[PDB]
Design a protein around this ligand. Structure first.
Ligand SMILES: [Cu+2]
Ligand SMILES: [Cu+2]
Ligand SMILES: [Cu+2]
Ligand SMILES: [Cu+2]
Length: 295
């Protein structure tokens, strides 16, 4: 794993690869999350245009890569339940064993560095079940990243919808957490999504609503591989639209929908969020499919 090629590998006059890999780490308990950081080598703005997972296709179940400015630690590596970043950890990439890859569409890149872009990458690697006879070989799992200083026409970002707090009342088998915001920027084109709960989430769905008509962004059971699922055909969201989501919870709290989009570079923002339910009555009209469980 260790056996080396430099952290930075120039590719042509304006592109370089960044190899982001665990520094020969040895998981000891099943189910461990290890984190590392890597500063961008350039101070000027640059664009992330591709990723390649380099996962121990023995023990690694999951990887996440975040962009942020303040990694939770300055150590060679650390344990993620002490944090990923102290500031907002902007998710850029997810990999899970046996999930579909989700690729950056051509002409799309995440904008990093420069004035307002992320200064660091933070890698999180989830090691699952190990054995107690493991020879303490080292693991250097991670991700290789393709960066260019060539301006991309389309800039990728994340629209994070979060529920802020419903409670699961006593005597409840089903609870809906609803989230909705108006959209008032230049168009975004949603091309992947990821859902996240901890309370036994049943199904999480996100929609664009335009003139009262709902268009599915994506729906998934939150209990399975939390990578990014591709949107069958990218959904454009424009000024006047409402983003809406419903998390369906069972008795026997947090619901996040991460919506990965691109925007025209001239008009792009790298992140947006909704933590409100501005149009709660609209949910009376929500498609029935939003309440159908995904076992
Ligand atoms: Cu995992
Ligand atoms: Cu969580
Ligand atoms: Cu709960
Ligand atoms: Cu089709």
């Amino acid at each position: 794993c260790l056996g080396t090629i430099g952290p930075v590998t120039p590719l042509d006059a304006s592109d370089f690869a960044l190899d982001i890999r665990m520094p020969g780490v040895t998981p000891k308990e099943s189910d461990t999350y290890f984190c590392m950081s890597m500063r961008l080598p350039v101070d000027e703005e640059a664009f992330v245009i591709d990723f390649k997972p380099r996962a121990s296709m023995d023990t690694v179940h999951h990887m996440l890569l975040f962009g942020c400015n303040m990694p939770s630690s300055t150590g060679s590596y650390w344990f993620c339940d002490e944090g990923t970043c102290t500031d907002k950890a902007n998710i850029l990439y997810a990999w899970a064993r046996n999930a579909p890859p989700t690729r950056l569409p051509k002409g799309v890149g995440f904008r990093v560095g420069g004035e307002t872009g992320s200064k660091y990458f933070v890698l999180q690697v989830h090691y699952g079940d190990i054995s107690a006879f493991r020879d303490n070989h080292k693991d250097c799992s991670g991700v290789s990243v393709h960066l260019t200083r060539v301006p991309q026409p389309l800039i990728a970002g994340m629209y994070l919808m979060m529920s802020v707090d419903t409670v699961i009342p006593p005597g409840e088998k089903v609870v809906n957490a609803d989230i909705s915001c108006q959209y008032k920027m230049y168009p975004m084109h949603v091309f992947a999504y990821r859902v996240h709960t901890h309370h036994l989430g049943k199904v999480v769905s996100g929609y664009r609503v335009r003139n009262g008509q709902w268009t599915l962004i994506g729906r998934q059971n939150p209990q399975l591989p939390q990578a990014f699922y591709p949107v069958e055909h990218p959904v454009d969201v424009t000024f006047g639209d409402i983003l809406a989501a419903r998390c369906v919870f069972t008795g026997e709290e947090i619901c996040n929908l991460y919506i990965m989009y691109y925007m025209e570079a001239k008009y792009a923002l790298s992140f947006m969020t909704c933590t409100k339910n501005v149009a709660p009555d609209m949910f009376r009209t929500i498609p029935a499919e939003a309440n159908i469980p995904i076992p």
